[PDB]
Every structure is written in structure tokens, then in C-alpha cells.
Design a protein around this ligand. Structure first.
Ligand SMILES: [Zn+2]
Lengths: 246, 216, 58, 47, 283, 62, 203, 48, 59
């Protein structure tokens, strides 16, 4: 809210009182935090793009996922993303230990809605199932590069305080594609983490209801690991209450 | 006469929204629906799609029957309109969405709905889990890597800085919105095609979990 | 002339700093314009004594 | 091969931030997982 | 992949040749010391550190003008009492092998020198020895090829412009003692010609002319020459007599009471030698 | 590391009419505002009582 | 009257600091000096001279003072601590003095309420009228800036004295908790920080 | 502006007193000062 | 504009925005210093008012 300060000389009683409104410092703090988080997320995204480049695949991401024949590259990209997320949670880890299998489904009767990437052991080693058609559909869905997204007082204050500044094939569309892939693989990684550390039955229960994620993860994630990418924003379904009533 | 170009633009935007082919969200109105239908009627190219949608004016709880030639013509027309890829699944999605819109009454407020009535038997998430998991276990790993390995992190800090500069003008808010809605709409399509109820509650529970982890 | 100093030995505490001034004359001036300190025979001419205060002339 | 809860658990430790700050201003290995594995084997063979 | 097909990217580039020095023994890690100046896109293709270490020379700027033009210039680091070989500021192609202790420094730097100085025989000898030394194929071969390619790229950047400057009519430079009535000047232009194109560029960037005629105006920076050129190369010697005192105050009470904040003339000895002519500004 | 190492009566007259109390007020408020700004930028909690202790003077009994 | 005499003494101390500044013989005002990052040597000399001046005042009998000190002018946010623009670390025997030049510049650039506030002063209109019938300078703003810098360096010097007298450990602990010098004078009298009080209240 | 003013005048009835009004109905969506502030400030900050 | 800028500089961007929203804050934020030490505002030469202000407000 507000505070005030009083200046006074030791030998004198003439005191000068000033008042401060903390809203200004609140704006400073909020702007600093927003900038810091934006920088962190952009750094992570750039790092992801850079390692994918390091793999040195000729085609762009969407073309790669469209090329059904080259399962090799799909598996490479998926594993690299999964390992990147794993390290982002455990920076000291740079490999994945146990070897990994991969399969690329091609039909609805082979895919599971809501979990394009999933895991299942063959009783000896873990296999990652990929819904390449779903990946292609997501990355191909037309994106909005125009509309903006969003207290009016602090909004205006930020508008008037913060400033603005007026050879890569990447547009905002490709950045969005990369972010979507990262988020999907992050969701899959959370499922896999719950699996590995709580058993296949717990993994199935999580698939049924993600809410268990709360405890099964926050026990370790919020404390020791970098926050989830989604943590950058609070997400919600438009007209959620009426939709639920429906 | 009519502004066939403006009609076409409105038709394209409405079709994109009703086919979930664009994360872009904007207001729509009966003026837009009329734009769309008039454009379809006037266009010789799109007569088949016009007929399809017009059939929605009836009970609309029916599966249109088309020859393979008819289906190919319709898909070609739609693909040329949206310039993409596509599927008869998207055709059915548009049919259902437009039928719901046409049957809906004139209202002072927009109606927010969920995709449904796409591709008869209602299946639960548990049944889908069992069946899909069995089929997956039947499937065999197309490819694999060996144990260990090493994540191929980049090294060129100059390259990283160049990429950072290239991405700076991208609003994280817009990118997040686009990605989240892309995933949500693809999940919606999968559920509707599978004829399995979409668990809005759990989908939102995902973000609930995100917040609960963040707060700690 | 502009006052300046020229260090000679400046290693640890030996700090011989010979003084020196600098030309304020370009590469085009000549004769009187170039003379820095005129002789007693020509200083009255080099300096415009009449243009300066009588005390300065003194 | 069982994953150990090294990071997951939080336990009491020497955490004097004053000492850490003072140190900061004055300025072949075995991991915790390996030590845990090794302890497990030693105790198994003890049984 | 991220970047457009090919699409050569644009970034800064370290320019000093010696930045490429690396231990051919991959099992031995080495880092060369480079002054940050190397990352300035200027006529200098050697960083301050390498310049001082190998040539005994330090960079410097000379304002020139209405519009203040900055002319590059180097200065002596040579002490007063240094003699003989020590006075060779930049050795000639016939003496660099001796002035520079090839034995005492790394093979990569020896190759760099035998490239700068047009010594194809020595370059070939080093290449063959490295071919038949150590695990050449594994990574030493690639490292050697990288260093050679970098040096050759720098030389190919410099030499064409150097030759065009040589045959240039508008811009003319004459590295000799402008006091033709002198004996320590000699055929300085001939010796400069003997130097390699890249070496000639370095000499141009380092040694300023005693005079400079721009169009119709001539500026005389010195009434004397602070360095000379002979068969040995660039020599930090006074052409007329006693060497100039070079205190070297850094790097390798009443007096101050009076001499408080007070303009001080530097004791440095810049490089002034020869005649330079130019038409228009070309700046 | 970067670096290593009469008329005062007239000036007293110059500053004599200045309200010393206001000088202290301005200086202290400048310091406090800058400290708050730095704290907000760093998103670090602020210890009001410790700042008061910084500018706290005990009074004797004579 | 008496309080006026103490005011005169305080202004004399400020004037002595002014003599120190003149001895330094800076062409620019301290505001411009701090604004100019390239003037690293000037900033370091200013800080060192202020510290020596404060040391002499705090220990009148002691004229000695560390005649060499490592200095680093910091600019980045991560290179500064809120509430401690000046810091005294040790790089394993090497004494480093870190300076938050942006914070100094901000404080100096802050507008002061010279005219804005009205305070009690000698306002005898009779004396003014009688005078009327009988008939290089420093502004109030500059004096305020100069006092602010002196008090900042006073805080820094107190932390430095804690460091030297007790050690780096206690110096860090003092940085964390400043309660050590609520008593202050207990030498200190010559320090302006012991002349007034400043407080913050919830509001 | 003239169209709106004259329309208001014509539609107004004959009255024994003059009618004092404010300009309105010029150029559909009602915007608040706060929204205008936000949008205009963003665009200005974009400007150089 | 200068009054707005003065309030900005001496009370922060949030206060500046609030003033833009409502100029009434000007009263205190300025009279604290203006009416005492500074020449009165140009507008001070006259008392200004909106014709039919009360009825317009009721509108
Ligand atoms: Zn270098």
C-alpha cells in the first residue's frame, strides 16, 4: 500500500515527513520479474532450437514430421526433446541411461487422444509411442500472429514506463511450433516421470486423471527443478463453468 | 452484384474457425454466416460444399453419402479454399459445426460450445486406453537408440545470441496462446473422432497442477 | 604557449618531470606571426602595444 | 538400477547462510547415487 | 534445421592472425592470449598483445584534420639501450626466421610465420612433418587445416587490396627517409616491395609518414624520422645519431605540488617515416 | 579488478542560508528511494527495521 | 542559537569535504563524474579520498590510512546489492572495493525538494528592512548531492571498519544486519550519520 | 460532426429556451479513457 | 503538459497516469509547491466555468 518516512536532527525537533506510495515499487518489481521470466523462456527456446540444429537435419521441423518415411529423424527429435526436458529438471543429467525404443503410430485406432506421446515398457525396456499424424496436425494448424493476449491502472503505468524498440527461416510461426512441441514433450515427460517413480499403475491413473501430478511432482519439481514452462502463465478454458455445466 | 472477394474472405475465416484449422479467435456473426453461404452458392467451384452445408438445414443428425468422386471433389475444393493437410474428418467436423450453428437460434450473445457428433458408440477413456495399449504393445519399435548416449547441446554462444535476437520481437504471450490452443484443438479433434467424451475437467486440471507446482 | 610537463625518470620514486610549453602556431603563420618571444629590438612591433592597456605596455 | 530420491527428499544440513556469504566474500569422484548403490550392496552382503 | 539453407551468417570475427595458435597435441590444452582489440574491424590484423610480444610495437591513433580523421599509427616499445637484433622492429623475410625463435615457440605459430613471410618451403616442411607426426589423421590434421585455412583467408583478404594499393595512382606512399640527404634511408621503397602484401599492409598501418600531402595541403608531422627500414626490416633506430630515450614507464614533493593536474607530454616514440600523398579524402 | 591507489569561510557563507534539516531530509529520502528501487528490481524482501537501525541514533542521559 | 552553532560545525565539516574535493581538483561536478563511466579513475579517487577523510575524522589521532586499494566500478544489477552501493570484498588477500555507479547516478539525479519544503529560518522583517534602508558558488541542490555522497561513503566506511577490525565474516553479518551501529557513537561524533535520525513507518 | 449536430437540432422540438448539448455520435464501440490510454501509449512507445 | 510532466517527474509514472485519468490530484501535488514559491498559473488570471455545467452533469 503506502509508507512514510520522518527525517529529524538529533538536537532539533523540526521533523520533515514524506509519504511514499508503494505502487511504483510494485510496478518496478513486476516489470523486472516479467522481463526476467521472458528472458529465461526465450533462452530455453533458443537453446532447444540450437541443439536441434546441432543434430543437423536438412528439412525444417514441420517437413520432418510430415515425412512419414524417415522415422529415424522423428525418433531423434523426440528423444532429444525428452532428454532436454529431463536435464532442465535434473541439470546434472546429460544422458538417459537405459536405452529407449520408439514407435510411430499411424492410425486413430493406434493413437490415444490427449497423449500424443506416451510410454510403455516391453518388460525389459521403455518404448515411446508417437502420434506423428497428431504432431503434424498440431504444428500445421494455422497460428494467429496478429492478435494480442491478456488492473487497468498498472497496465497504463507499465505502458507509459516500459519502452519499446522498433538470416533465419524462423518466423513467429516456427517459434510457436517449437514451443508447442516442447510443451507436448514436457507433458509426456511428466507422465513418464510419474511412471518411472511410482509404477505403471500410478502411470495409468495419471493418464486417467492428471490431477495426481500435483503431489506426485510438486514433491520434487517445485523445490529442486526449474518451474514448468506453462508456469509462465495462468491458463484457463473460456466459459469453463458453463461448459462444465453442459 | 456482390463483393465476391469480401464474401470469400469471410467464408475462409469462418471455415477456418469452424474446422479448428486456425488458432486465431475472433468475433463472428450472422452477417459472416450469410457471407459464407452466399459465396459458396455463387462459386461454381464450391457447389458441392454448398450442397453439403445446405443439407444441414434438415435434421442434420445424419451421415451424407457420397461417391468417391464426390468426396474427392469436395476435399479438393476445401483444400483449394484453405490452401493447405485436410481430411474428410475435417469435412465432417465442418458439417457438424455448421449444422449446430444453423440450428441454433438468433441470440443476443455468442454461443460457446465443444466439438461433438464427429465420426455412434460412446467410448470411455478407460476403454480407449485398454484397446489402444493392446494394439501398441502388439506394434513393434520402428527404431531405437542405445543406452546412455548424450544430449547434443549446442556450443556456439554467438549462434545462440543470433537466435535470441531473431526471436526477441516474438511475444511470448501470443506464442503461448497459439501453442496451448493448438494442443487443445487437436485433443478435441481426437476425442470427437474417437467418439469418447472429452474431460474438460482434467484438461483444466493440467493447468491447476501447473499452478499448484508453481505456488510451491 | 601552452604549459606542459615532460616526465624523464618515472619508475619508482625518481620523478624527474621537466617542464615544457607547446606551440600555438599553425603551419602557415610566418615572420611576426610565428615569433614566440620577440627580441627587445622587435617586441614593440610584434606586440600591438597600442592595442593593449598602458599598464600591460609598462 | 532403482532410482534413488537424492534430490527429492530434503533433510537437515549445515545451512548457515552467514558462513556461506563469508566464504563467498573471502574468495575421480563418486556421486550421491553411486554412494547409495554402494551402501545398498554393502548392506546386502552384510545380511 | 533452424537457419536458412546456407545463408552465410554475419557476426564479429577475431582478426589477429595469432589468435589461431593451438597446441597440435590435442591432449595438451592451450589458450593464446589475445587483446580484445582483435575484435575491432579495422586495418589491424594483429592484436595489441601479439604486436607487443612479437614486434615490440604498440598501436596508437593520430587525429588528422575540420573533420577529425583518425590515422592509425604504432609506436616503439624499444628501449634506448637495446642493440643489434633487438633493434629489428619487424624482421625481413631474410631475417625473421632468426629474429623470431621458431624453436622456442609453437609449431602452429611457426607455420603462421612461414605463411606471413612467403616461405613455401618451410610451410611444406611443417605440413609434411605434421602429416608424419602424431595422430595426424584423427584430429591434428583437421586442426592444422583449420589454422592454415584461417591464415590463408586473412592473407587472401589482404593481398589483393595491397596490390591494388601498390598500383594505385590516387594514394601513394613512400617508406624512406624524407631527408634524401641521408644514408640510413636507402631504398626503403625497394625493401617495402620485398615485403609480403600482408606485411606491407601492416607496415602501412603502423608507420605514419613524416609528411602528408592531401590534394594541395601538406602536413608535416615530424622534422625527422623516428624509424628506418633496411635489409633486416623495420629498425627502431635513429637515422642520424643517438637513439631516442624510451622510458617505458609501464607494462614490461614540491615537484608534484607544482605539477598537480597539469598537461603532460607523453614520452612515447611514434613511428614517423617517409612521404605519403593522397587525392581527395577517400575517408 | 580495475583501479588501484580561508576560501572555506566564503563557501561556508555560500551554504550558510541552506536549511540543513532539509538537506538531511532530501539526502535520506534519496537514499531510501534508491534502496527501495534496487530491492524491487531484485525482487528481494526489504527489512524496514534494519534500515531504521542503519539510521538509528541512541540518546544518552546527559 | 546553540543548535545553530552545531549547524555551523556541520557546515564546516561539509566545507572541509569541499576542500578535499578541490584538492582532488575535478573539472566536472560529481554528478557528471559519476554519469561518465569512463572516469573510472576519478570515481575511485573520489571514493578513496572520501574514505580517508572519514577515517581521519573518525580517528582524529590517526592519520594513517590504507594507501592502496583494489577498485571495481560495477554497472550491472547482478553486480550490486540493494541498500549497499559500496562493498568491500576480499579476493583471497586482495581488498576489492565495488561501486554501484548507476545507483550513485540515480541518487544524485533525483530531484530535491529545496524550494518545495518550507522550514523555520531567521525571518526578522525588521532586520531586513533596516538593512535595505542602510544600503564559484555551490547551490542548495549541489550541497544536498554532496551531503548524500558523503553519508553514503560514511555508511560504506563504517562497513569497511567492521571488516578490518572484526573480519570479513562480521562484515558480511553487518551487511545482513545493521543493528551493530544503532548506538553509533560509543570518534563517531565527527560522522554526520550520528547527527540526525531517519525512520520508516507503515502507512 | 455537422451531420450529427444538424440531426440533433432538426429532431429537437420547438422550445422557449435554447438547448445546450455536447458533441456526440461522431465516428460504434464505446471506449473508456483507460483503454484509450493503454492502446495509445503502446502505439506511442512503438513509435520512435 | 508541463504540470503533467512535473507530477510525473516528482511523483512517479503511476502518479502521472493517475493524474492523466483525473487532473484533480493536481490540486495537492502542485499547490504544495506552486502557490507558495512559483508564479501563479496563467489560468489563474480568470475563473473559468462550463456553461450550464450542472445540467450538463445531470445529462
Ligand atoms: Zn590476439
Amino acid at each position: 500500500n503506502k509508507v512514510r518516512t520522518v527525517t529529524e536532527i538529533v538536537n532539533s525537533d523540526e521533523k520533515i515527513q514524506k509519504t511514499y506510495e508503494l505502487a511504483e515499487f510494485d510496478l518496478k518489481n513486476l516489470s523486472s520479474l516479467e522481463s526476467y521470466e521472458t528472458l529465461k523462456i526465450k533462452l530455453a527456446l533458443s537453446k532447444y532450437m540450437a541443439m536441434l540444429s546441432t543434430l543437423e537435419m536438412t528439412q525444417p521441423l514441420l517437413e520432418i514430421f510430415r515425412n512419414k518415411a524417415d522415422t529415424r529423424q522423428i525418433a531423434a527429435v523426440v528423444f532429444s526433446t525428452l532428454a532436454f526436458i529431463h536435464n532442465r529438471f535434473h541439470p546434472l543429467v546429460t544422458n538417459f541411461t537405459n536405452k529407449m525404443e520408439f514407435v510411430v503410430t499411424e492410425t486413430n485406432d493406434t493413437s490415444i487422444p490427449g497423449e500424443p506421446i506416451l510410454f510403455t515398457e516391453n518388460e525389459g525396456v521403455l518404448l515411446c509411442s508417437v502420434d506423428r499424424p497428431s504432431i503434424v496436425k498440431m504444428l500445421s494448424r494455422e497460428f494467429d500472429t496478429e492478435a494480442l493476449v491478456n488492473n487497468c491502472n498498472v497496465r497504463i503505468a507499465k505502458t507509459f514506463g516500459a519502452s519499446k524498440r522498433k538470416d533465419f527461416s524462423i518466423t513467429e510461426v516456427e517459434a510457436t511450433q517449437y514451443l508447442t512441441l516442447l510443451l507436448t514433450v514436457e507433458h509426456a515427460y511428466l507422465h513418464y516421470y510419474i511412471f518411472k517413480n511410482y509404477g505403471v499403475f500410478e502411470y495409468c491413473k495419471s493418464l486417467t486423471d492428471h490431477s495426481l501430478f500435483t503431489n506426485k511432482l510438486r514433491s520434487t519439481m517445485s523445490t529442486k527443478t526449474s518451474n514448468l514452462l506453462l508456469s509462465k502463465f495462468k491458463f484457463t478454458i473460456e466459459d469453463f463453468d458453463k461448459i462444465n455445466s453442459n | 452484384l456482390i463483393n465476391m472477394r469480401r464474401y470469400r474472405n469471410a467464408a475462409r475465416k469462418l471455415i477456418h474457425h469452424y474446422s479448428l484449422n486456425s488458432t486465431s479467435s475472433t468475433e463472428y456473426k450472422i452477417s459472416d454466416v450469410v457471407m459464407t453461404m452466399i459465396f459458396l452458392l455463387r462459386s461454381e467451384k464450391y457447389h458441392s460444399l454448398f450442397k453439403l452445408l445446405e443439407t444441414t438445414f434438415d435434421d442434420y443428425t445424419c451421415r451424407p453419402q457420397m461417391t468417391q468422386v464426390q468426396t474427392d471433389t469436395l476435399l479438393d475444393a476445401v483444400r483449394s479454399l484453405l490452401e493447405m493437410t485436410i481430411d474428410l474428418t475435417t469435412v465432417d467436423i465442418m458439417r457438424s459445426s455448421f449444422a449446430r450453428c444453423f440450428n441454433s437460434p438468433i441470440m443476443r450473445y455468442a454461443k460457446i460450445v465443444l466439438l461433438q457428433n464427429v465420426a455412434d458408440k460412446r467410448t470411455t477413456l478407460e476403454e480407449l486406453l485398454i484397446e489402444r495399449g493392446e494394439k501398441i504393445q502388439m506394434l513393434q519399435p520402428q527404431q531405437y537408440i542405445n543406452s546412455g548416449t548424450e544430449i547434443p547441446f549446442c556450443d556456439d554462444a554467438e549462434f545462440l545470441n543470433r537466435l535470441l535476437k531473431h526471436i526477441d520481437p516474438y511475444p511470448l504471450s501470443r506464442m503461448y496462446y497459439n501453442a496451448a490452443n493448438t494442443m487443445f484443438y487437436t485433443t478435441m479433434e481426437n476425442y470427437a473422432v474417437s467418439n469418447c467424451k472429452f474431460n474438460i475437467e482434467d484438461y483444466n486440471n493440467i493447468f491447476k497442477v501447473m499452478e499448484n507446482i508453481r505456488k510451491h | 604557449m601552452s604549459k606542459m610537463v615532460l616526465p624523464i625518470f618515472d619508475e619508482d620514486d625518481n620523478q624527474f618531470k621537466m617542464t615544457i610549453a607547446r606551440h600555438l602556431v599553425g603551419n602557415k603563420e610566418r615572420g611576426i606571426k610565428r615569433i614566440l618571444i620577440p627580441s627587445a629590438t622587435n617586441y614593440q612591433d610584434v606586440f600591438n602595444l597600442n592595442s593593449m592597456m598602458q599598464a600591460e605596455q609598462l | 538400477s532403482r532410482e534413488f530420491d537424492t534430490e527429492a527428499l530434503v533433510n537437515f544440513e549445515n545451512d548457515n547462510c552467514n558462513v556461506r556469504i563469508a566464504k563467498t566474500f573471502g574468495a575421480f569422484s563418486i556421486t550421491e547415487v553411486e554412494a547409495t548403490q554402494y551402501l545398498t550392496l554393502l548392506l546386502t552382503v552384510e545380511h | 534445421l533452424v537457419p536458412v539453407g546456407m545463408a552465410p551468417r554475419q557476426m564479429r570475427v577475431n582478426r589477429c592472425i595469432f589468435a589461431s595458435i593451438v597446441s597440435f597435441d590435442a591432449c595438451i590444452t592451450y589458450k593464446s592470449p589475445c587483446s580484445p582489440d582483435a575484435y575491432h574491424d579495422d586495418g589491424w590484423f594483429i592484436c595489441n598483445n601479439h604486436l607487443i610480444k612479437r614486434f615490440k610495437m604498440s598501436k596508437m591513433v593520430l587525429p588528422i584534420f575540420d573533420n577529425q580523421f583518425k590515422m592509425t599509427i604504432a609506436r616503439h616499445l624499444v628501449g634506448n639501450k637495446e642493440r643489434g637484433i633487438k633493434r629489428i622492429l619487424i624482421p625481413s623475410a631474410t631475417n625473421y626466421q632468426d629474429v623470431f625463435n621458431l624453436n622456442s615457440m609453437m609449431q602452429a605459430e611457426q607455420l603462421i610465420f612461414h605463411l606471413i613471410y612467403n616461405n613455401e618451403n618451410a610451410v611444406n616442411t611443417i605440413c609434411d612433418n605434421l602429416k608424419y607426426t602424431e595422430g595426424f589423421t584423427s584430429n591434428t590434421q583437421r586442426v592444422i587445416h583449420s589454422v592454415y585455412a584461417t591464415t590463408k583467408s586473412i592473407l587472401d583478404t589482404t593481398n589483393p587490396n595491397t596490390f591494388c594499393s601498390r598500383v594505385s595512382r590516387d594514394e601513394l606512399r613512400f617508406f624512406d627517409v624524407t631527408n634524401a640527404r641521408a644514408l640510413r634511408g636507402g631504398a626503403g621503397d625497394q625493401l617495402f616491395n620485398n615485403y609480403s602484401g600482408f606485411l606491407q599492409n601492416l607496415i602501412r598501418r603502423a608507420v605514419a609518414p613524416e609528411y602528408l600531402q592531401i590534394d594541395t595541403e601538406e602536413l608535416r608531422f615530424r622534422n625527422c624520422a623516428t624509424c628506418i627500414i633496411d635489409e633486416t626490416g623495420l629498425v627502431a633506430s635513429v637515422p642520424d645519431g643517438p637513439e631516442l630515450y624510451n622510458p617505458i614507464r609501464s607494462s614490461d614533493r614540491e615537484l608534484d605540488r607544482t605539477l598537480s593536474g597539469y598537461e603532460e607530454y607523453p614520452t612515447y616514440v611514434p613511428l614517423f617515416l617517409g612521404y605519403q600523398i593522397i587525392n581527395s579524402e577517400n575517408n
